[PDB]
């Protein structure tokens, strides 16, 4: 297809078939080649030290995650980040009712909010126990990343001065969340362990636990 755009003529169809055939040979070698490079140890853009989990957070039952984390780290996490897929669409409801509190006891949470979901984010992180303390802002056009806090952060674990509340797009016209965010988290916690929910394959940085339906 589309039906409309194809030739209905015998001569058009014959030449199209001829050109499709050459093209298939062309892309065949590209596939075989690609597939071979992969076999002989090619390396992905993913950093070595990240924990990708492909799951659905509605279905996901966090307890295994919690148990596994306690088991290997002895602490729950220090920073949680979320770019919810607002109504690919989850109703306000099932995002809201996630049992996030189990996930962390003492640290920071970062949540992305389009202007429509901005207020909703406030009272959903308050529900999870957090106190609103900050907002980063991204210019490209603006979107807010709302920051909240729970527990004691008076440990040496979290460093008090924050590099910026403004963040800037890596590249013109960009729609993936900027990288500088990961660095700022690095400021707040250096070499702590962090969890991301609703993660994408580009969202993976080593030392991070990332969970998402597309990872």
């Amino acid at each position: 297809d589309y039906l409309d755009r194809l030739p209905k003529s015998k001569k058009g169809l014959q030449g199209l078939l001829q050109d499709i055939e050459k093209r298939i040979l062309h892309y065949k070698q590209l596939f075989f080649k690609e597939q071979n490079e992969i076999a002989n140890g090619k390396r992905s853009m993913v950093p070595d030290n990240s924990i990708p989990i492909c799951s659905d957070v509605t279905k996901l039952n966090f307890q295994a995650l919690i148990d596994a984390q306690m088991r290997h780290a002895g602490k729950m996490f220090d920073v949680i980040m979320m770019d919810p897929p607002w109504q690919d669409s989850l109703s306000d409801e099932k995002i809201q009712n996630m049992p996030i509190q189990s996930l962390q006891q003492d640290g920071f949470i970062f949540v992305w909010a389009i202007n429509a979901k901005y207020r909703v984010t406030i009272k959903m992180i308050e529900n999870w126990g957090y106190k609103l303390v900050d907002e980063i802002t991204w210019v490209k056009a603006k979107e807010s990343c709302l920051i909240g806090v729970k527990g004691d952060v008076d440990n040496g674990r979290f460093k008090k001065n924050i590099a910026s509340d403004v963040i800037f797009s890596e590249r013109r016209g960009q729609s993936q969340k900027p990288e500088e965010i990961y660095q700022y988290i690095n400021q707040l916690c250096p070499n702590g362990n962090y969890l991301e929910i609703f993660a994408r394959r580009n969202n993976l940085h080593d030392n991070w636990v990332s969970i998402g339906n597309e990872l």
Partner: protein, 130 residues
């Protein structure tokens, strides 16, 4: 005192999907050089090799029904078998039932035949050129 590299390894084994990480624990990079949804697993590949024995080279549809519960890509099947026999075009083997042991030998012969005429690329012998 936390060793992250070990940390990632442990976490992955207990939480990650089997395609994502090795029993080793280390990160399976091949999974991320492919689009999500389209990963070809090692249990997929034996399924295919089984299907050549039972149904024959041409019949991708019958294979898809029996071995993949209908969920494979028929084109991917065709392409994967080209690799299995080491030739670029397999119309020659169409209809044939081949043995997992025979397929290696067929492919070995085809690479043999291949390397020599100098039509050999990326481990496939290009009987068809253009």
């Amino acid at each position: 005192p936390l060793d992250f590299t070990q940390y990632a390894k442990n976490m992955r084994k207990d939480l990650s999907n089997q395609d994502i990480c090795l029993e080793d624990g280390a990160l399976n990079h091949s999974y991320f050089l492919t689009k999500k949804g389209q990963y070809w697993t090692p249990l997929n590949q034996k399924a295919l090799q089984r299907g050549i024995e039972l149904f024959g080279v041409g019949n991708w549809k019958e294979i898809n029904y029996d071995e993949f519960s209908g969920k494979a890509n028929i084109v991917e099947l065709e392409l994967r078998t080209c690799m299995i026999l080491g030739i670029n075009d397999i119309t020659e083997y169409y209809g044939k039932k081949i043995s997992e042991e025979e397929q290696e030998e067929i492919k070995k012969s085809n690479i043999a035949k291949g390397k020599k005429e100098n039509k050999l690329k990326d481990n496939i012998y290009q009987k068809l050129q253009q």
